[PDB]
Amino acid sequence: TVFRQENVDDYYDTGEELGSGQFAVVKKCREKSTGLQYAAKFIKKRRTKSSRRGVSREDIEREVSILKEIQHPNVITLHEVYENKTDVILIGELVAGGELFDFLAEKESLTEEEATEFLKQILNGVYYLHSLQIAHFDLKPENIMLLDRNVPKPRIKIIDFGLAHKIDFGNEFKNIFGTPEFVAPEIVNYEPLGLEADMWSIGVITYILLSGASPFLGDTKQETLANVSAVNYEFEDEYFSNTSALAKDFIRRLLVKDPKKRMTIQDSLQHPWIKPQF
Ligand SMILES: OC[C@H]1O[C@@H](n2cnc3c(NC4CCCC4)ncnc32)[C@H](O)[C@@H]1O
């Protein structure tokens, strides 16, 4: 599939840099014709077939195709796509209140109500995605943005669909691998992957929201990955003595090695706490 090949500078002005990945930079921008503001993600293209640098056409097209489908208050929208020789440029929804997650770093420890207010929104976004058989595969606090701080009212949107896949046969087998602290054992063990991997990541995010501590983090990436595969975590009393038994129960039912035994997104919404690499 091809994208708009006019110069993006003829239609938009860019401003502040909003963030970065290894092969991507995101900038605030403004559409000249409407004055409306967006975020433009510039993704570096591969310069050859066998190149390790940049993102393959197939991977870019997949992200774009997923972004085109989705429309939900807790997930980003896509506005336009441009491309030139070096970049594909996604123009989408500007989320201006920063990462979850710089908010977690700047702020003191959260109450359970605070944590569940964020968490319920993440669950609603993921419920939408999973209903569509879309696995995000990269859920982590850096990919949960506030829309808003300020309106607190602290509404969120899930971002960065670079690893997302349609799961039309129950699982995908192709070496998808996110950030060690947040990946499920099946990712670590290079096993077939499905919607369940996202539910594990939600358990990790929930543990961090409540405690300020990362459940599997070691001093090196290999240690982190070994910890994940072995389900080597515990609830430290120093961090969790204030925390309700139901909150711990919710996390315990997500941080389960066997994907088939892990809570699903629907299970997570019915749970008594919620129900109203190298
Ligand atoms: O993903 C790298 C970092 O850039 C930041 N980031 C990524 N995407 C966005 C975005 N809108 C997406 C709509 C479609 C294109 C962009 N809006 C604001 N910040 C973003 C965030 O800090 C993230 O951790």
Q: Please name the amino acid found at residue 118.
A: F
14-104 — its CATH code? 3.30.200.20
Peptide bond into 153 cis (omega under 30): yes
Greatest alpha-carbon span in the chain: 58
Domain range 105-276, CATH class = mainly alpha
List beta partners, residue 157: 145
Q: Ligand 1 pocket: which residues have CB below 6 Å?
A: 18-21, 26, 39, 41, 76, 90, 92-95, 99, 142, 145, 159-160
| Cα distance between the two ends of the chain | 32
* Contact predicate 147/157, CB 8 Å: yes
- What is the Cα 114 distance to its own chain's centre? 19
Q: Where are the beta strands (DSSP E) in the chain?
A: 12-20, 24-31, 37-44, 78-83, 87-92, 134-135, 144-146, 156-158, 165-166
Given ligand 1 and candidates 72, 76, 95, which is best to mutate, with the most ligand atoms within 8 Å of its CB? 95
- Which residues are CB-neighbours of 40 under 8 A, at least 6 positions away? 8, 12, 14, 26, 27, 28, 29, 89, 90, 91
From 9, 138, 148, 219, active-site residue: 138
**CA 19 – CA 244 distance, rounded (Å):** 35
Nearest-CA residue for ligand 1 atom 24 is: 142
- Which residues are CB-neighbours of 156 under 8 A, at least 6 positions away? 74, 100, 118, 121, 122, 125, 144, 145, 146, 147
Classify each residue of 103-115 as buried b or exposed e, where b means 16 or more C-beta atoms within 10 Å of its C-beta.
Answer: bbeeeeebebeeb
Helix (H, G, I), strand (E, B) or coil at 5: coil
Q: This structure's resolution (angstroms)?
A: 1.6
**CA 192 – CA 186 distance, rounded (Å):** 7
Domain residue limits, the chain: 14-104, 105-276
**CA 45 – CA 106 distance, rounded (Å):** 35
